[PDB]
């Protein structure tokens with residue numbers, strides 16, 4: 001059995017608010033033909049502006065990952081793309097009635113549930129993977145992001161906060177998707193912010209849609225959310241979720257390993273751009289026989 005490209009079986013809709021804009025937004029996920037990739041569409045505009053979710057269309061990366069075409073933007077794509085990558089969706093149209101993707105509960109959980117509710121459709125074309133053949137790294141100050149050849153898909157991440165809440169083994173995590181489920185162990189990890197940083201963002205008219213219902217708020221000594229964390233290491237697992245979404249801007253599932261040290265959307269995008277430019281470090285591969293493949297996907 002060939003590892004096939006996947007799309008959605010049915011259209012599905014969601015309503016929410018943009019984390020940074022605070023704007024109400026309607027999201028529609030639609031099936032798409034083979035080799036379309038993930039394509040965002042601003043349906044509030046006339047004509048409709050389509051922006052493929054590709055590294056070349058990445059705009060500002062100071063807070064969230066943004067896609068740009070001309071002066072048309074699609075903000076905060078990373079959690080939705082993380083859900084797409086996690087469920088192996090190759091092709092889909094993502095329609096939005098506003099510039100920013102809804103934040104939902106701040107994780108990829110509501111998206112993974114909406115996608116699986118609609119169901120997946122295997123398509124009549126081989127799924128294309130980007131296989132890391134050589135190591136590629138990028139650094140900036142003490143931040144680092146690396147691609148390493150690896151027979152499968154693995155993400156390691158380490159955060160470094162000199163803070164009472166961020167001590168012990170909860171500051172690093174590695175997820176090997178051959179034995180670990182993206183859905184159970186990464187997808188529910190919510191976005192987070194430190195109270196002083198969030199205050200700064202609010203003073204700059206950013207984080208307008210943020211609340212304890214869609215973000216973990218940390219002050220100088222504790223988690224302010226009354227109901228607590230979903231994972232003991234929720235923060236570093238959210239950084240893993242971000243990296244998976246940002247890596248999906250390559251346009252294809254990866255066969256390799258990512259390692260991040262204090263990395264964020266900007267350095268993740270720099271890593272993709274360096275990888276793409278270094279064509280000796282990667283190749284496109286397919287699996288006409290699923291038994292020889294190092295990556296496996298759930299039933300559609």
Ligand SMILES: C[C@@H](O)[C@H](NC(=O)c1ccc(C#Cc2ccccc2)cc1)C(=O)NO
Pocket residue numbers: 063064065078079191192193198201207208209210211212215217238242264
């Ligand atoms: C973890 C970070 O890398 C980032 N998240 C943020 O930058 C961020 C920004 C603002 C808020 C917020 C908020 C808020 C506003 C008012 C009241 C309570 C929370 C949360 C996370 C992120 O998840 N990018 O995808």
Ligand SMILES: [Zn+2]
Pocket residue numbers: 078079191238242
């Ligand atoms: Zn995030």
